[PDB]
Amino acid sequence: MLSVASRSGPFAPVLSATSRGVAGALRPLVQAALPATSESPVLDAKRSFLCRESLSG
Amino acid sequence: TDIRVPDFSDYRRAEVLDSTKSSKESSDARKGFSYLITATTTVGVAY
Amino acid sequence: WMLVADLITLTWIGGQPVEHPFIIIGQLASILYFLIILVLMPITSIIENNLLKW
Amino acid sequence: AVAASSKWLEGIRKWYYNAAGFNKLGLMRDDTIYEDDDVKEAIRRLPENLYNDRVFRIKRALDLTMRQQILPKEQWTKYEEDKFYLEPYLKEVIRERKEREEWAKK
Amino acid sequence: ATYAQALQSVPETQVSQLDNGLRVASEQSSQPTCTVGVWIDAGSRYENEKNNGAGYFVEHLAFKGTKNRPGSALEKEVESMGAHLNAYSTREHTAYYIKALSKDLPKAVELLADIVQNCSLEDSQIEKERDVILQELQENDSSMRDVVFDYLHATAFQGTPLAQSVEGPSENVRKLSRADLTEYVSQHYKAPRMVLAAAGGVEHRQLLDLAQKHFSSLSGTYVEDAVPAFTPCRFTGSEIRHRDDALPLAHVAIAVEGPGWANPDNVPLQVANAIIGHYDSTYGGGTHMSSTLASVAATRKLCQSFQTFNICYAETGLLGAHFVCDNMSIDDMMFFLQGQWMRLCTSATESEVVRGKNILRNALVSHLDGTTPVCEDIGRSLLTYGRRIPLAEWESRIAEVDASVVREVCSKYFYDQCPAVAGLGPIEQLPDYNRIRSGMFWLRF
């Protein structure tokens, strides 16, 4: 009745027609890259960088 | 973030070297030396 | 081979003098050279397609 | 689409089948089609067992023609056992090309 | 029960002003949550070379102590309500906003006024944030899209304050003292340059009373009343190439000069970029797609992903595309992209322009779903256009566009111009600048 996404932590993947594949709700959770360096993906199978947040109008 | 372009004002045209007020304007009055000078190559090679 | 036997006819007529039998034979064989290539060949291939059900 | 003289026209279709001679090389009708870009897409959509049967029948007929020979008459393809195996795949490839073409003008 | 009738029923934005110059705007929607924030006209284009890091240094220190709420006391009362604090900082804007419940609006406005006025800049929290920034820079160096878009600004606007980056160089981060940061706040954090916005369940009359109570100690006339005036920033056609063969994929961005914020050319230039489109290798229908560049890059497997962009500033802008591919594919990606720009200057059909108008209508209304994207549209439209442009006015500017308008505006901005180019990674097959510049015209017309 309350969803998988309502309590945080189980996974969900998404497929689109005109948009990009996504994974999970809280997976990459914040105060992880606050310290050290969590350097990010060195890409070899490049999916996007900002997830279609442009073309706002 | 430490990589800036070095200055090109030894080569930059007669009025575009100081970067204050000319983004796309006065571009027609800068490019009119490379194109009708091609004209008297064409009316040079016309005859 | 109607078209090959029509180019043999036009070779014989081209070496004859211009009198009565060789003047109507010469122009009825100039018509047949264009009627076979342009009209009779594309219609005959469609009849063959229809007898094989494509 | 005549109903009384479609016995006459069934005999003309049999006569033309024997006068053409791909049956004497052991071929079927869809083996002899000219391969344009449309027919080449229907070939790669065939199931594996039908594709393999077609490659051997063509290779065997190309070998008989190198030697100017034909098959024994007991191995000639009969008119009622010629299977039009490629025709349903080809109608679908053509129907999809007409749809990309009506979309581009409208 | 019609798309026309639904655009009239959208509630309106109310704008007020205080005596010191501060503007107050809100949109009421009937719902139990809200978002409130403060938008400022500050950014790295207002800095010079001695203090280029300074505005990103003070955005680090903003959530870490004021005079009334020292240290982690601010953090404890935000979390004990169930609320969120966020910030960002571009080349021209700066924001701080809170997302909370509608009954906690008096507490949320009080915290935001304490952050932007009374913020402490103590000398032990500095020299501790200096380390966090210095390894934040190294993390950004592994994001290749962020490096390549910084290269494009540095070469398109070379001798100008729009060329420098938001974070600054590493040598400035190591030297920015306390007096440089207190002087930055006194010059740019001033009432006539700030907007207090809110969306969700709020009433404008109550938001105005909280602004008079907490935001009226700001002085309204400038110190020694010296006025700002934006010195404009020129575009230069040029190129920068970062060669590195151990990177597995290459990043290329290319741009011509575009229009600023208030130019009416911006609407037909966004119908045009929606005809070129975007692509990624995880899309579902690749070979059947309506974009020509997307249908070709899926059939031949030419790239990983491409996008078009339209970035605006006050007087100038950037208009172009970005793509990611392997080392044997750069030359065919440049050929097919420039062939699409020239095909729109001529040859642009009416059926293409109907699809590009439908895409832009959908992207406008889908971006305004939720209280945080509505509140950010209020806070930066008041600094860019001076007002909030409603959705019925956007729809009448889109209906005017046809194929001859698109054919005219594209020839003005693309045809026979010098582009700016940036590249990074295995880029030996990136074509020569002379060969790129010749691709900007067709010898037919």
Added chain:
Amino acid sequence: PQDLEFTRLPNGLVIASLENYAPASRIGLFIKAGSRYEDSNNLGTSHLLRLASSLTTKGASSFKITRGIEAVGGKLSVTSTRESMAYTVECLRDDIEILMEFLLNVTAAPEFRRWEVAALQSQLRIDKAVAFQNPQAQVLENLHAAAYRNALANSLYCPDYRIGKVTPDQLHYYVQNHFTSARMALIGLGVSHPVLKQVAERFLNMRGGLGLSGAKAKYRGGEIRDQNGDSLVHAALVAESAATGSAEANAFSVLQHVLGAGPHVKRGSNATSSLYQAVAKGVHQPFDVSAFNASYSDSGLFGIYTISQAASAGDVIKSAYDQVKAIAQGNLSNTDVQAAKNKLKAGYLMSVESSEGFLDEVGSQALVAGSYMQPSTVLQQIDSVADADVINAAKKFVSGRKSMAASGNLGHTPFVDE
């Protein structure tokens, strides 16, 4: 207004619509399918079904679906979890009856032609490698395999040996047995209620009934280690908790916010997280800790999640686990239970705020409970959790049998028995 119209058809279908007066519409179809309904002979069929939404159907070709949706500027997407699949369509309000016919063709009349299914097999390899660039994707698939024997041990992504071998007859069998009317909910957000009903008798002609009887999930207390070359160690440690829609499940949700479930301030030091403060007493390297919660229809998992450096991984896990023991023997202040209820209530109202979050919330209620409840009924259930119920949930974790999964350089990571 008009809060929601809610209707059950005489063969199980649930229909629910809300009439906003917004310029855009959203329509979703929610099905009880997903990776928990496949056995060991057909693993990865649900991953390929997710990728196949724009193939040829009986009423539209694959060219017409891509061109027809893009002509009006619309979208089509599929979202899945271990227990659910969701098909979503959105466009502007005048175009929504065009995109409804496409959505009923993708779900109620698919064809699975050989040459189209064979060209799609290579997409499975691309989609899995993109998702596994995040290290939490593989840790969380290994954690479900360590925790269950079956039903809830199947991954969301196709196994590597199986890529290339999902056949068209396996796809036809999955849809025929799991996509039936008593397992489906049709949810509309900017449409009317009688227009969705006439859409519903267009696929009420077939596929009636419940499907098949998946099995109960059986708990296994296991361990899966994965040595690799990643720079940080990820680790998770859980126990069996409580199913969705019970009074103990609400107590585990409150306990998650007591310990800490993610930050509220950008770059803040997490001053009200119990787990984060206890670890930071003796560890002065970069790290991150969180409480983990996952609730399902017949079981649940609760525990902790750490990210640390390799030489500090045992120090972080022991400090975090020692904090949950302190709660389980009575140390729990009353002002801490109240601040946890505020974070749980405010997070629930912020997640239903947009159209995507609201449509998801209504669709999961119709599959599991078959009804709709207002958020004021939900907020009462959270306030009725007592302090003794939170202490009892922390004793079920401490005494229960554990499961574990880890990855990275595991040379200083403890085993689940130590």
Added chain:
Amino acid sequence: MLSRFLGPRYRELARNWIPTASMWGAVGAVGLVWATDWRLILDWVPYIN
């Protein structure tokens, strides 16, 4: 057969290329009048005799 050139928006493409194609028929009216020195249209303009 050549109704591939028959579309409602394909004849729209003749409307935007014939203003360029309105003119190079007048290059032949001016370019080999130059080259082969045709005395027909040297009678035309009083610039040239």
